[PDB]
């Protein structure tokens, strides 16, 4: 039967505070600007730190010391006046100051447009003049020539006065404004303004009335009284939040708020004294204005006039400045490679582990007889007495820690590992996860965190384990995969060779082959056929191959032994490649499953490293092989250049043409020497059995590393072999003379100097790039954060198709890569006629995708977030596969964040690119701005030469016709009537995303944005699923604008969320009422981010003061729907394991 409870907060209300409420907050009034006594250092009575008001300095102990124990609790000492309770209450209890004269709150005055000003219909200047005593503003005349609610001159004020008593009166300062606020009746005024909106004029009248009505209605509904914007009682913050404390040295340190409060109290008390002493009006005016200034300074410092300063060098910290985590059980250290580790493990230093796990260790040492009690356990453990170690081993058993490396760009920046205690001070990290952390061992450090609860630990072991996240949430490709040495090893053992030494051996199976390979006569593999049984065919569990003897290599034979156990014998023996190894791992993941693939990954690592070490791969100066052709090509280039010089001095060609020809000649020469380098390494001669010379790829280290994908690029390789090239000037122009030298030879000082510029520009680029990429990531996170998978399905077939995306070549960037992991929107069918392909409302699968590929090319159709009709989110089918773990995204997954991190993470790779990506995500109206996106579908050309408005042009659809006014200059591809293209877009320059939205609708914008973003990443060769970009685009298209109200309360031109107008429209239409007609609105990620309704989130984003004043005025309530609100609250977020909990609550509340 109702009644108050504990915690269980379901809502937060914000409102203007009445003086009554402010006094209800107050335990006592602070009457003195005293702090503490100079001698006793105890709090001065009735001052800012007084114990009678805020609380006892010491727990359960009154000031004079009469009552020192918890025996008395709630008791108030008769002698000293102090209640006996916990001193903690000094953080909670609040005071107040009673102002002798009202003072207007600064936020509701100086923030533009002023809320007080807007309510009272007073311009900033007038409100300033009245509040700060410059002029009197006549109020409530109810007759006479003089205008009510208007200002006046003193001589005028008097002259007027003479003409009538009990007429319009007005007292300068906050008293007048408070009077206007109390006396104004909002009901009557909304009535009047509503009558005013009837006025026949089209513009300038209805809009203003609409804004005024907006504010008025805000006040009407909220229930707050306008006069509350003027303060009578000014609240006083608890002392512990503005402390005066003794530092280490015995010196005192104080929060600036204490000083601000002191100025306030001083001026207020002095004002009371001056009033009681019947001071002249000039002095009382000065004091009142000073008081207003002091309150101003206390609330916001610097908003109005010069900010108050302790000293000129620093300004005081006001409440506004105050308004706008570090963790326990955490550590950090330098990281080192841990090759011997399993993917789910990490090396954790013993000392670190002893500190991190100390309470658990105490508990366990108490459970076992190792110590009598926790205290004894601690005293013992610091000693480090033996068996404490074994106990620590017992403690961390099955337990997992979190490892994190800054910057955390995506969710794999934090992963869970099972700790292996190790001697030494370094954290040992597994090599396969270095990619995901972007971690290397040149001195990087990582932080460790200990999940405490069973719930947290379960979250870590299930959701966060490195071994459970083997593939990128962005591209769906493996994230934890072999890199560097591993590849080098595998490639070394899987290499074609003349193989004269070990050729012609039947393996007797992988086992005997392995024995012999380790034995003798086999080195760097061999051209020998192996007997191993292969198979593992699927569509049946039986598997098995009757005969499996195939040409192979000792390393190749070895690989099959290494637990592949998932077919692809053909894939083996094809020689190792980094890309090939990644593909092998992925295929193994799909066919053979996750756990077993993890084991496969570990095996591939182990073997890769093992052979990598014994390969003997190294780099000598002679391993950088120059081409004899270089001197020839250089001589040729010199000759051609001389020919161009002679041809120039003749006057046949311009300076420009000559420059261009020189640059081109040199470019081609650089290509030539590159080719020569790569050719020289690429072919080699070795003796064949018969005696013939065979041509092998070669095992040269630069070449081997390059070909294997272990390390290197052709451009880099040519830098030690072939002539360097052309340098850029700082202006960007290309120097005439190239760098003939190559790093093996070494280059002249001038060449190096002329380089330093490029080098410097590079480092500066990367350094700035981290900062910019971070910003993009944060914008995307802020815009997409509320998105979550809210249900399995929403019931709409609607979706997009998507094309091959290749502009001309058509070769790459299409088909299954784009299609895979999606859901079919329609019963798509393979080939002409009979058709009947079997996937409808079905998640695309690799086997199914292969089916679609086999049956020629498919036009295709697909479920997408863009077309998802789910209210306040997306659904499992429309999203498709969770790319980190092949399956339909588990309900409750927070898609938005994942999207933001997926797009944001390779930000530093785009280079400065990234500005283009941000330009697209922010929906900028591109400068060239073109195309006649009129969709009238008809055309009648015209004129009316009025500058830009000259061209004009008219479309003439059979039903109706319209007129658009263009701009001088430019050209058109289609001219004069006939409506050549219904799409039109006659002018060149790329349509604005907004123009594209109005003319072509939502689907076209989703297509355009996704493809145009993808162009950038592709140009940088980065793999990213369209899905995330679709999430973000969906957030961009969130807003809609009403064209016709219908039967609803909504106004024409009013903007509102898609979901809200859809729900409303279904309500009306199912209620038999005319639905609202609406038009799609597209806003960039910034504007969308700034859009969100909840005030805790918004205020925690940016622009805290504005958000908080508007919220407080409107009397808003935060329902805690999103993540930010709950995080701030310290609540369990409505996502993941929390998503399940949140729903039950939401339902219970409704």
């Amino acid at each position: 039967k109702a009644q108050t409870k504990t915690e269980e907060f379901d809502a937060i209300k914000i409102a203007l505070a009445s003086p009554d409420m402010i006094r209800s907050w107050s335990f006592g009034e602070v009457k003195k600007p005293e702090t503490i006594n100079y001698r006793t250092f105890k709090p001065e009575r009735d001052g800012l730190f007084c114990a009678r008001i805020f609380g006892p300095v010491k727990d359960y102990e009154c000031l004079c010391g009469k009552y020192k124990r918890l025996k008395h609790r709630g008791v108030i000492c008769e002698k000293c006046g102090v209640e006996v309770t916990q001193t903690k209450v000094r953080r909670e209890r609040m005071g107040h100051i009673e102002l002798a004269s009202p003072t207007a709150h600064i936020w509701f005055l100086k923030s533009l447009p002023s809320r007080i000003g807007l309510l009272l219909d007073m311009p900033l200047r007038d409100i300033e003049r009245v509040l700060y005593f410059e002029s009197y503003v006549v109020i409530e005349g109810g007759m006479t020539n003089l205008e009510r609610q208007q200002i006046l001159t003193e001589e005028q004020y008097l002259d007027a006065l003479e003409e009538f008593g009990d007429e319009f009166d007005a007292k300068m300062g906050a008293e007048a404004i408070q009077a206007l606020l109390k006396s104004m009746d909002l009901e009557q005024e909304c009535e009047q303004l509503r009558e005013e909106l009837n006025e026949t004029n089209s513009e300038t009248k209805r809009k203003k009335l609409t804004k005024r009505i907006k504010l008025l209605e805000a006040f009407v509904q909220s229930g707050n009284k306008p006069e509350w914007m003027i303060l009578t009682v000014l609240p006083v913050l608890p002392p512990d939040l503005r402390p005066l404390v003794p530092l280490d040295g015995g010196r005192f340190a104080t929060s600036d708020l204490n000083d601000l409060y002191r100025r306030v109290i001083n001026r207020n008390n002095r004002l009371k004294r001056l009033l009681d002493l019947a001071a002249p009006d000039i002095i009382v005016r000065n004091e009142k204005r000073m008081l207003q200034e002091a309150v101003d300074a206390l609330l916001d410092n610097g908003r109005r006039g010069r900010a108050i300063t302790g000293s000129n060098k620093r300004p005081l910290k006001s409440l506004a400045d105050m308004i706008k985590k570090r963790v326990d059980y955490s550590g950090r250290s330098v990281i080192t490679v841990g090759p011997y580790l399993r993917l789910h493990q990490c090396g954790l230093p013993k000392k670190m582990a002893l500190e991190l796990f100390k309470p658990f260790i105490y508990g366990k040492l108490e459970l076992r007889g190792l110590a009598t009690t926790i205290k004894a356990a601690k005293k013992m453990v610091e000693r480090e007495e033996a068996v404490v170690w074994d106990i620590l081993d017992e403690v961390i058993r099955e337990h997992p820690v979190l490892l994190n490396r800054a910057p955390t760009l995506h969710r794999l920046g934090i992963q869970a590992f099972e700790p292996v205690l190790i001697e030494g001070k370094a954290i040992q990290l597994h090599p396969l996860v270095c990619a995901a952390y972007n971690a290397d061992f040149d001195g990087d450090q990582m932080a460790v965190h200990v999940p405490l609860t069973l719930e947290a630990q379960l979250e870590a072991r299930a959701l966060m384990m490195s071994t459970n996240n083997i593939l990128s949430p962005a591209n769906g490709e493996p994230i934890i995969v072999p890199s560097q040495d591993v590849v080098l090893g595998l490639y070394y053992m899987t290499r074609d060779c003349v193989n004269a030494k070990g050729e012609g051996m039947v393996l007797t199976g992988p086992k005997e082959a392995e024995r012999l390979y380790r034995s003798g006569l086999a080195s760097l593999h061999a051209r020998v056929k192996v007997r191993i049984t292969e198979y593992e065919k699927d569509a049946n569990g039986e598997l098995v191959a009757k005969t499996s003897l195939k040409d192979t290599t000792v390393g190749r034979a070895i690989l099959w032994m290494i637990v592949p156990k998932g077919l692809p014998y053909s894939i083996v023996n094809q020689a190792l490649g980094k890309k090939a190894i990644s593909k092998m791992l992925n295929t193994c993941y799909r066919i053979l499953g996750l756990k077993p693939t993890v084991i496969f990954a570990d095996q591939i690592m182990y073997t890769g490293f093992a052979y990598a070490a014994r390969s003997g791969a190294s780099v000598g100066i002679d391993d950088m092989v120059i081409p004899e052709k270089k001197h020839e090509i250089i001589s040729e280039a010199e000759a051609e250049v001389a020919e161009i010089q002679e041809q120039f001095q003749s006057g046949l060609v311009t300076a420009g043409e000559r420059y261009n020809k020189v640059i081109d000649i040199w470019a081609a020469a650089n290509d030539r020497v590159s080719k020569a380098m790569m050719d020289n390494l690429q072919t080699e001669t070795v003796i064949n059995r018969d005696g013939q010379e065979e041509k092998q790829v070669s095992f040269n280290s630069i070449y081997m590393m390059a070909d294997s994908g272990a390390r290197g690029s052709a451009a880099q390789i040519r830098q030690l072999a072939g002539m360097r090239g052309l340098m850029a000037k700082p202006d960007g122009s290309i120097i005439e003379t190239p760098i003939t030298a190559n790093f093996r030879e070494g280059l002249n000082v001038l060449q190096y100097f002329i380089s330093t510029h490029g080098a410097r520009k590079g480092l500066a680029d990367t350094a700035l790039k981290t900062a910019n990429s971070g910003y993009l990531t944060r914008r995307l996170v802020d815009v997409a954060q509320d998105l979550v998978v809210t249900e399995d399905d929403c019931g709409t077939h609607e979706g997009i198709m998507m094309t091959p995306v290749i502009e001309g070549g058509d070769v790459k960037e299409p088909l299954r890569d784009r299609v895979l992991g999606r859901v079919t929107a329609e019963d798509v069918l393979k080939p002409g006629t009979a058709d009947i392909l079997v996937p409808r409302n079905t998640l695309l699968h690799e086997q199914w995708c292969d089916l679609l590929e086999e049956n020629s090319v498919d036009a295709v159709k697909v479920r997408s977030v863009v077309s998802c009709d789910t209210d306040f989110g997306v659904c499992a089918h429309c999203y498709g596969r969770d790319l980190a773990r092949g399956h339909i995204i588990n309900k409750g997954e927070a898609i938005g964040v994942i999207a933001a991190q997926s797009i944001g993470e390779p930000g530093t790779q785009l280079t400065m690119g990234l500005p283009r990506v941000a330009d697209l995500f922010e929906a900028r109206r591109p400068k060239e701005p073109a195309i006649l996106a009129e969709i009238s579908g008809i055309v009648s050309f015209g004129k009316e030469t009025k500058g830009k408005r000259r061209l004009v042009i008219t479309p003439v659809d059979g039903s109706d016709p319209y007129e658009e006014m263009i701009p001088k200059w430019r050209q058109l591809n289609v001219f004069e009537g006939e409506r050549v293209e219904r799409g039109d877009v006659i002018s060149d320059g790329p349509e604005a995303p907004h123009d594209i939205l109005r003319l072509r609708g939502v689907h076209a914008v989703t297509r355009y944005i996704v493809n145009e973003v993808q162009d950038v990443y592709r140009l940088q060769g980065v793999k990213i699923n369209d899905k995330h970009i679709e999430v973000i685009v969906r957030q961009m298209l969130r807003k809609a604008t009403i064209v016709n109200a219908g039967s609803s309360d909504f106004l024409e031109g009013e903007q509102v969320e898609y979901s809200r107008v859809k729900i409303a429209n279904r309500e009306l239409e199912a209620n038999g009422k005319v639905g609202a007609t609406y038009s799609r609105d597209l806003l960039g990620i910034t504007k969308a981010s700034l859009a969100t309704e909840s005030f805790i989130s918004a205020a925690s984003f940016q622009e805290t003061t504005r958000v908080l004043t508007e919220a407080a005025v409107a009397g808003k309530r935060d329902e805690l729907r999103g993540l930010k609100e709950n995080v701030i609250v310290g609540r369990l977020i409505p996502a993941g394991t929390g998503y399940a909990y949140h729903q039950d609550r939401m339902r219970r509340r409704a």
Partner: peptide, 9 residues
């Protein structure tokens, strides 16, 4: 603004 200036005036 500037109460000093006002007061001097």
């Amino acid at each position: 603004t500037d109460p000093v200036r006002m007061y001097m005036r």
